[PDB]
Ligand binder design. Structure first.
Ligand SMILES: *[C@@](O)(c1nc2cc(Cl)ccc2s1)[C@H](C[C@@H]1CCNC1=O)NC(=O)[C@@H]1[C@@H]2[C@H](CN1C(=O)[C@@H](NC(=O)C(F)(F)F)C(C)(C)C)C2(C)C
Ligand SMILES: *[C@@](O)(c1nc2cc(Cl)ccc2s1)[C@H](C[C@@H]1CCNC1=O)NC(=O)[C@@H]1[C@@H]2[C@H](CN1C(=O)[C@@H](NC(=O)C(F)(F)F)C(C)(C)C)C2(C)C
Lengths: 306, 306
């Protein structure tokens, strides 16, 4: 029992972190096989960043200008290319600790672990959700750029996020590992704001199932609802629409607990309409939306990784 | 910016986890150099656990009865001994991934990361506090015993916790790495309850400093208080006494923000007396007590590990 915000074990990713320095600029990179992936703005000074022409800055660089360090050891760069907002540095040594891996673009509502790094060294690990507005509520300082986010499935690391920037209200934005931003953001120091965020309904329901499994059951009511009527209420409280696909994904938890999804929706509707009245669910005084159905099952069933 | 419950990177510990099987009982062990450390109740069946005589059970075992597996590979056991509630299995192979490490007994109020493991494989990592009542609010299932808790300081892993059991209300209890329990608990399946818990005052103050550093400043009032008067109020709300040592430990955060500790105490007193009135601090609707002053500084200053 118990339910915690749990991150994936970070060791497979720790073995891939390096430092990339170009001129006076240093950030983190990810070394897989013989390639180092990092934010392209390693080639910028704190003056180029107001309106940089990356293509222009890069043509004036050559391989030797990129100083890549894995711990002590310098990796010799033997090629470079830009892909969207990431640079790929081909190095002359393959990383012997490279895990089985994939690059995936995640969808809003999905979670992942972040390994926050500075100067190529890991500081800590935490779990994040890709928010509906394509930001993450991270914890990142100067020097954190090139830190990555990931999921693990058995032995395979799915890298889904590389960190680039901090927006107003202290939320974060970055790219997939092909250098395409999540959301409408650009890698330049210019006025940018996140869209209004929404609550990830399916994750809230997942977490309510987690509460039932842990014996926190006070909020279950005796009613059901239709999907349609549920969505009209959710809408008012700035919850995302619940789709049939979401219902289908909640099927395992529904089967385990014997609570139909639309019955749990009726309980959620009452929490939204009446509040929690000073009570907690799983220790929390607010409804939590950063656990996916899979996160709940993984945690409550003891799924392990290689 | 941003503030998250952040765990240490787990890789150094992942490289030390193994599976120990005795008879039909399997739990996790920790392999450092040529020793495997695990809960002594690996030698028990689900019948011996009501009132086990460990000394008696152990004398009937020999080295070969302990099946130790590191991934695929079986490690040959060449000696065994019991120390308090842990077994130490001497094996014929030194773990080549052993980090620099120490065994430490932590104090109530201190935090650490848990690497939750099943069958010798890691499932996830999260941060925990040793509660004043010597429990932790963990997330552990059947098969999690022998999972460890740890801190990292640069290159050195301080192991402070090995998991043994779950108490009523879904909280957890275990030992240091010399097999001595935290709190009054015993490794037997018998009626045991945690003492009433208390809020870790110094950690709450630490977290309020974290809020100020992140620009969440609404709760700062214009007053100060004495330590004595603060402690009379804290007492009523089941907060631990704040000592001068606690004040001294908050000195770095106080200096950084320019808010005297007793001024922050006055703000805390008002939160305790009046509540948060529906507002949040760092996204939380309750006062949080599982961040130490050091955790705040580590996270807000970007301290990294080897
Ligand atoms: C990185 O770690 C990077 N730092 C540098 C420094 C130099 Cl000289 C070159 C390239 C990089 S990448 C940080 C992480 C930030 C810092 C604070 N917290 C974080 O998460 N990234 C940045 O500094 C990026 C970088 C330029 C600006 N920037 C920002 O995050 C801006 N944000 C914005 O302008 C806004 F649009 F998002 F809001 C701030 C104001 C400095 C936080 C670029 C976007 C390329
Ligand atoms: C371990 O993983 C262990 N499991 C086994 C199984 C066998 Cl056959 C032998 C030895 C061990 S150690 C679990 C972890 C628990 C299970 C649920 N969540 C967890 O954290 N530990 C236990 O099962 C320990 C073990 C015997 C009982 N026990 C318990 O946790 C009891 N708790 C208590 O009796 C109480 F006093 F704490 F409350 C419960 C009721 C089974 C949870 C011993 C204490 C040696």
């Amino acid at each position: 029992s118990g339910f915690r915000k749990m991150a994936f074990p970070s060791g497979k990713v720790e073995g891939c972190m390096v430092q990339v320095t170009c001129g006076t600029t240093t950030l983190n990179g990810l070394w897989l096989d013989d390639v180092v992936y990092c934010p392209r703005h390693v080639i910028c000074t704190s003056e180029d960043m107001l309106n940089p022409n990356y293509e222009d800055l890069l043509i004036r660089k050559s391989n030797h200008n990129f100083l890549v360090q894995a711990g002590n050891v310098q990796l010799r760069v033997i090629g470079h290319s830009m892909q969207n907002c990431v640079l790929k540095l081909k190095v002359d040594t393959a990383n012997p600790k490279t895990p089985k891996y994939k690059f995936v673009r995640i969808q809003p509502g999905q979670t992942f672990s972040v390994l926050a790094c500075y100067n190529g060294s890991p500081s800590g690990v935490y779990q994040c959700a890709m928010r509906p507005n394509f930001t993450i509520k991270g914890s990142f300082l100067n020097g954190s750029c090139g830190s990555v986010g990931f999921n693990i499935d058995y032995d395979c690391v799915s890298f889904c996020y590389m960190h680039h920037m901090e927006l107003p209200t202290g939320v974060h934005a970055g790219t997939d590992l092909e250098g395409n931003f999540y959301g409408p953001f650009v890698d330049r120091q210019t006025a940018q704001a996140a869209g209004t965020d929404t609550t990830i309904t399916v994750n809230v329901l997942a977490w309510l199932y987690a509460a039932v499994i842990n014996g926190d059951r006070w909020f279950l009511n005796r009613f059901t609802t239709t999907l349609n009527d549920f969505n009209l209420v959710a809408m008012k409280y700035n919850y995302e629409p619940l789709t049939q696909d979401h219902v289908d994904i909640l099927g395992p938890l529904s089967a385990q607990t014997g609570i139909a999804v639309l019955d749990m929706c009726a309980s959620l509707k009452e929490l939204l309409q009446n509040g929690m009245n000073g009570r907690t669910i799983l220790g929390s005084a607010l409804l939590e939306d950063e656990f996916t159905p899979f996160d709940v099952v993984r945690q409550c069933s003891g799924v392990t990784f290689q």
